[PDB]
Scaffold this active site. Structure first.
Site, PDB file in Angstrom:
ATOM      1  CB  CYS B 106      -0.944   0.041   1.208  1.00 30.45           C
ATOM      2  SG  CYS B 106      -2.094   1.468   1.194  1.00 30.45           S
ATOM      3  NE  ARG B 109       2.243   0.826   3.684  1.00 31.10           N
ATOM      4  CZ  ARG B 109       3.378   0.187   3.938  1.00 31.10           C
ATOM      5  NH1 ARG B 109       3.555  -0.360   5.137  1.00 31.10           N
ATOM      6  NH2 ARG B 109       4.325   0.069   3.000  1.00 31.10           N
ATOM      7  CD1 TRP B 278      -7.010   9.026  -2.688  1.00 32.63           C
ATOM      8  CD2 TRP B 278      -8.160   9.340  -0.790  1.00 32.63           C
ATOM      9  NE1 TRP B 278      -6.168   9.616  -1.771  1.00 32.63           N
ATOM     10  CE2 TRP B 278      -6.846   9.796  -0.594  1.00 32.63           C
ATOM     11  CE3 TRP B 278      -9.077   9.436   0.268  1.00 32.63           C
ATOM     12  CZ2 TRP B 278      -6.420  10.345   0.610  1.00 32.63           C
ATOM     13  CZ3 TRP B 278      -8.654   9.980   1.465  1.00 32.63           C
ATOM     14  CH2 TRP B 278      -7.334  10.431   1.626  1.00 32.63           C
ATOM     15  CD  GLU B 283      -4.951   2.027  -7.163  1.00 27.48           C
ATOM     16  OE1 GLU B 283      -5.528   0.952  -6.815  1.00 27.48           O
ATOM     17  OE2 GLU B 283      -5.016   3.077  -6.481  1.00 27.48           O
TER      18      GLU B 283
HETATM   19  C1  HEM Z   1      -6.746   6.593   1.117  1.00 30.98           C
HETATM   20  C2  HEM Z   1      -5.956   6.476   0.037  1.00 30.98           C
HETATM   21  C3  HEM Z   1      -5.261   5.158  -0.423  1.00 30.98           C
HETATM   22  C4  HEM Z   1      -4.418   5.104  -1.461  1.00 30.98           C
HETATM   23  C5  HEM Z   1      -4.006   6.318  -2.339  1.00 30.98           C
HETATM   24  C6  HEM Z   1      -3.956   3.739  -1.622  1.00 30.98           C
HETATM   25  C7  HEM Z   1      -3.063   3.262  -2.584  1.00 30.98           C
HETATM   26  C8  HEM Z   1      -2.847   1.931  -2.882  1.00 30.98           C
HETATM   27  C9  HEM Z   1      -2.393   1.354  -4.147  1.00 30.98           C
HETATM   28  C10 HEM Z   1      -2.048   2.146  -5.434  1.00 30.98           C
HETATM   29  C11 HEM Z   1      -2.321   0.022  -3.992  1.00 30.98           C
HETATM   30  C12 HEM Z   1      -1.910  -1.002  -5.069  1.00 30.98           C
HETATM   31  C13 HEM Z   1      -3.176  -1.624  -5.650  1.00 30.98           C
HETATM   32  C14 HEM Z   1      -2.921  -2.501  -6.857  1.00 30.98           C
HETATM   33  O1  HEM Z   1      -1.914  -2.295  -7.584  1.00 30.98           O
HETATM   34  O2  HEM Z   1      -3.759  -3.406  -7.118  1.00 30.98           O
HETATM   35  C15 HEM Z   1      -2.738  -0.300  -2.631  1.00 30.98           C
HETATM   36  C16 HEM Z   1      -2.810  -1.547  -2.063  1.00 30.98           C
HETATM   37  C17 HEM Z   1      -3.365  -1.864  -0.838  1.00 30.98           C
HETATM   38  N1  HEM Z   1      -3.912  -0.983   0.077  1.00 30.98           N
HETATM   39 FE1  HEM Z   1      -3.958   1.076  -0.063  1.00 30.98          FE
HETATM   40  N2  HEM Z   1      -4.567   2.995  -0.619  1.00 30.98           N
HETATM   41  C18 HEM Z   1      -5.387   3.821   0.136  1.00 30.98           C
HETATM   42  C19 HEM Z   1      -6.174   3.420   1.221  1.00 30.98           C
HETATM   43  C20 HEM Z   1      -6.165   2.177   1.852  1.00 30.98           C
HETATM   44  C21 HEM Z   1      -6.952   1.735   3.012  1.00 30.98           C
HETATM   45  C22 HEM Z   1      -8.008   2.613   3.722  1.00 30.98           C
HETATM   46  C23 HEM Z   1      -6.618   0.445   3.285  1.00 30.98           C
HETATM   47  C24 HEM Z   1      -7.113  -0.522   4.392  1.00 30.98           C
HETATM   48  C25 HEM Z   1      -7.607  -0.102   5.568  1.00 30.98           C
HETATM   49  C26 HEM Z   1      -5.585   0.058   2.342  1.00 30.98           C
HETATM   50  C27 HEM Z   1      -4.956  -1.172   2.281  1.00 30.98           C
HETATM   51  C28 HEM Z   1      -4.346  -1.711   1.169  1.00 30.98           C
HETATM   52  C29 HEM Z   1      -4.057  -3.112   0.916  1.00 30.98           C
HETATM   53  C30 HEM Z   1      -4.358  -4.303   1.861  1.00 30.98           C
HETATM   54  C31 HEM Z   1      -3.462  -3.197  -0.281  1.00 30.98           C
HETATM   55  C32 HEM Z   1      -2.964  -4.484  -0.989  1.00 30.98           C
HETATM   56  C33 HEM Z   1      -4.128  -5.169  -1.694  1.00 30.98           C
HETATM   57  C34 HEM Z   1      -3.588  -6.242  -2.601  1.00 30.98           C
HETATM   58  O3  HEM Z   1      -2.455  -6.713  -2.359  1.00 30.98           O
HETATM   59  O4  HEM Z   1      -4.273  -6.634  -3.576  1.00 30.98           O
HETATM   60  N3  HEM Z   1      -5.360   1.125   1.502  1.00 30.98           N
HETATM   61  N4  HEM Z   1      -3.040   0.882  -1.993  1.00 30.98           N
HETATM   62  C1  K9C Z   2      -6.223  -5.646  -6.842  1.00 28.53           C
HETATM   63  N1  K9C Z   2      -6.237  -4.636  -5.766  1.00 28.53           N
HETATM   64  C2  K9C Z   2      -7.168  -3.582  -6.183  1.00 28.53           C
HETATM   65  C3  K9C Z   2      -6.984  -2.406  -5.333  1.00 28.53           C
HETATM   66  C4  K9C Z   2      -6.907  -1.420  -4.702  1.00 28.53           C
HETATM   67  C5  K9C Z   2      -6.964  -0.358  -3.978  1.00 28.53           C
HETATM   68  C6  K9C Z   2      -7.564  -0.450  -2.718  1.00 28.53           C
HETATM   69  C7  K9C Z   2      -7.678   0.680  -1.921  1.00 28.53           C
HETATM   70  C8  K9C Z   2      -8.316   0.578  -0.554  1.00 28.53           C
HETATM   71  C9  K9C Z   2      -7.212   1.902  -2.404  1.00 28.53           C
HETATM   72  C10 K9C Z   2      -6.610   1.957  -3.681  1.00 28.53           C
HETATM   73  N2  K9C Z   2      -6.146   3.116  -4.172  1.00 28.53           N
HETATM   74  N3  K9C Z   2      -6.505   0.842  -4.450  1.00 28.53           N
HETATM   75 CL    CL Z   3      -9.011  -1.257  -9.284  1.00 34.52          CL
END
Ligand code: HEM
Ligand code: K9C
Ligand code: CL
Ligand code: HEM
Ligand code: H4B
Ligand code: H4B
Ligand code: K9C
Ligand code: CL
Ligand code: GD
Ligand code: GD
Ligand code: ZN
EC number: 1.14.13.39
Lengths: 400, 402
Positions: B106, B109, B278, B283
């Protein structure tokens, strides 16, 4: 055996070649460290293993010369404490080191390598002439040819052959009236080692540094490279007429002169290898890294881009045009170069070839994926397994 | 402890937090597998719970206090008597925030403290489950000013099946196999699309049909639930200078809500706990629209841009993908829907690593997931070495329930 998936197509392979790994890497089940850059009689076991590789590769296991060659290395170590490689073996060992380099995206080419044997080299003045043969051979008026020159194998209780520059061609790094750098900041240190040992420093942003060549147990010696021999490409853009005025240039031959070739237990601390450039190396890393030439903002002003907000993606637009200018310039000058799309597509072909021949391929994902347009290339979508096979190119400390 | 270098500045730190990684990943000293997407009794429940409670009581600056050993003894006695235990509400909230904090893939964070936690652990049916999910989407979307939230459904417990959301995200577009061999819609969703139809959904035939939800109550077949169209905020895609771009008929939705991951806190397992933030524009612009196995629009855009597509060295692929990203960003801004570009997001991730080095001595990070899929070395995370490892609480992958 590790399952390996390609996410574009859905296809699956198993890396059985990983089983043969030798020098343990930096990773443990506790934590992965793959993104880090720089993470007597035992000489016989590695020699046996290399000879075994040679003969099975030429279909010669269970044969006379195989049986026979095993004894000579046995006898040579017993009598001398080391051994000399047969000329064909040094050839086969150099190609295999290249082939086993996990960070090289251009290994589709690994079977075409010219091997200059400088094992009877004698002085720094002799090094320089080998180096100069190599360069002129590799450069070939811009039709570049992969080549390695192999200097003598280090021996116990006696000095090392070493090239002090990280590459055969490097631009100067001068420090200025405000500490900061005119030229290439990657070479600030070796520029100051050169100015030290007699070199008269210039004032340009693109001055070919003079070589520092090290005869064993003698101090390094400055050697100027003949300018006719250092082929260089002035950079211009096919449609941005002002780009030429920025006075940007890069050199034609990428020739790494600081890595240590290890074949069958023998260590060659001087063994420069060269190929041709992938365009993102010059256009993206060398020209646009904040700690390299850092030209990104200057090109963006010239394009009249909106640099006040990151979401205009002006960094991305300016970078793409810098890469366009590199490709166009090298092509106009008829210097061999390859773009990241062609390069990575050839590497997917290599991976497939290697799966049929050796059952896998050590590849370092972070280094094979190009530094612009990652997921637009097929390697982005390819799972990879990293590990160490011998013979290999290894990193080595700096000789000072 | 592992030394970590930033190659742009020269900074050097040591990841002491990695020492405490109390689960194993896929790499060995023989071989690194960091680039793989999917690598993978009361005594152990107790030691996980014990460690989480220590974490909680550290965060409230009450380590080694009355309350602290109170809760420990309490949790053991509840395991002894029942084989499990229940989280207090504030423990649940701290546990969801740390799970986001600990997520190595992520990039967003920096925001890990700002998270709205909806406690749906009293939920009793798929029908109530649906109502909670609609409320989540409503709150998180907030008319385009997106808010990070998570809804936590009842934990796995012996004697009963799990709540599950069969859909990988709360908003997904259908993918239909065509007359020939092609997919209409999003090819990543052929499977879930087939499941919905098999469970009685009436399909459309557009490229952007929002899918229904398949919601599983314990020991219950999944139930279909349609999302009210005015609940799913979407953004038509246009380009600020390429007026023909709007005629592509492309859309994306506002809310990225992952719904198929497992939240683990203190040994307890919540197989249904959807979370949302968001989007980062790559993505959508790079991956979702330009992957050959996703919408795959790159060539079509480049031909429209009058780029020379017969040769790779003209860099038409790179040029056309930069404009598709420009379009995504400009469209979300026009629509007043929160969105962050990969330059801003990677810059604020660098502050996160800084904050985290001071607070905990490290930060687990998956380099290949943190570095954006375009313009990698133009962002500072490219030049930052990283250490990937697993800390608990955590979001984890889990098998498909079918
Ligand atoms: C608020 C703005 C946020 C942004 C800009 C963001 C950004 C990202 C991005 C770009 C990814 C990669 C996704 C992909 O390539 O499929 C990611 C993965 C992830 N995010 Fe964040 N995220 C946000 C919020 C959150 C929140 C609120 C949570 C959980 C409470 C979270 C947990 C995760 C997790 C678990 C992954 C990995 C999912 C996977 O491996 O498929 N994120 N995030
Ligand atoms: C395959 N993972 C899809 C995804 C995603 C994702 C999830 C969250 C919470 C935020 C973000 N910006 N992207
Ligand atoms: Cl998506
Ligand atoms: C012929 C065309 C070739 C191309 C296009 C090519 C491409 C590349 C590229 C782009 C890199 C990344 C370097 C960096 O980012 O700093 C690399 C690394 C490397 N290449 Fe190649 N290469 C070629 C030939 C060769 C040859 C002939 C050899 C040796 C005989 C070789 C050995 C290596 C090694 C050892 C590395 C690792 C460098 C390091 O770890 O610092 N390559 N190659
Ligand atoms: C920190 C990170 O591992 C480092 O910047 C690496 C990433 N990938 C790379 N890949 C290549 N080919 N060359 C490099 O110098 C780097 N740098
Ligand atoms: C095989 C490879 O690991 C895979 O395509 C990864 C690379 N890095 C990624 N990074 C992010 N953020 N998201 C992804 O889906 C992927 N995919
Ligand atoms: C610091 N790495 C510099 C380099 C390099 C390199 C070396 C070779 C043989 C080919 C290539 N295309 N690039
Ligand atoms: Cl270079
Ligand atoms: Gd102008
Ligand atoms: Gd226009
Ligand atoms: Zn690893």
């Amino acid at each position: 055996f590790p399952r390996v998936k390609n996410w574009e197509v859905g296809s699956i392979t198993y890396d059985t070649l990983s089983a043969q790994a030798q020098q343990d890497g930096p990773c443990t089940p506790r934590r992965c460290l793959g993104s880090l850059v720089f993470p007597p009689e035992q000489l016989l076991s590695q020699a046996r293993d290399f000879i075994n590789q040679y003969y099975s590769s030429i279909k010669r296991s269970g044969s006379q010369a195989h049986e026979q060659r095993l004894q000579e290395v046995e006898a040579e170590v017993a009598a001398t404490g080391t051994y000399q490689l047969r000329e064909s073996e040094l050839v086969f060992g150099a190609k295999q080191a290249w082939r086993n380099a996990p960070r090289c995206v251009g290994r589709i080419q690994w079977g075409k390598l010219q091997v200059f044997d400088a094992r009877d080299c004698r002085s720094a003045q002799e090094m320089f002439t080998y180096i100069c043969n190599h360069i002129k051979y590799a450069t070939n008026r811009g039709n570049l040819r992969s080549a390695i020159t192999v200097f003598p194998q280090r021996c116990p209780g006696r000095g090392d052959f070493r090239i002090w520059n990280s590459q055969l061609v490097r631009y100067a790094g001068y420090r200025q009236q405000d500490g900061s750098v005119r030229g290439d900041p990657a070479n600030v240190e070796i520029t100051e080692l050169c100015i030290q040992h007699g070199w008269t420093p210039g004032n340009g942003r693109f001055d070919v540094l003079p070589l520092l060549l090290q005869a064993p147990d003698e101090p390094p010696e400055l050697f100027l490279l003949p300018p006719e021999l250092v082929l260089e490409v002035p950079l211009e853009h096919p449609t941005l007429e002002w780009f030429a005025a920025l006075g940007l240039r890069w050199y034609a031959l990428p020739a790494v002169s600081n890595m240590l070739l290890e074949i069958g237990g023998l260590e060659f601390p001087a063994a420069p290898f060269s190929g041709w450039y992938m365009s993102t190396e010059i256009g993206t890393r060398n020209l646009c890294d904040p700690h390299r030439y850092n030209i990104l903002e200057d090109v963006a002003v010239c394009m009249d881009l909106d640099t006040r907000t990151t979401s205009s993606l002006w960094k991305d637009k300016a970078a793409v045009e810098i890469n366009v200018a590199v490709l166009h310039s090298y092509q106009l000058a008829k210097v061999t170069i390859v773009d990241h799309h062609a390069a990575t597509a050839s590497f997917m072909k290599h991976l497939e070839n290697e799966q049929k021949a050796r059952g896998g391929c050590p590849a370092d994902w972070a280094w094979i994926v190009p530094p612009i347009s990652g997921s637009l290339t097929p390697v982005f979508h390819q799972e990879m397994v990293n590990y160490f096979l011998s013979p290999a190119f290894r990193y080595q400390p700096d000789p000072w």
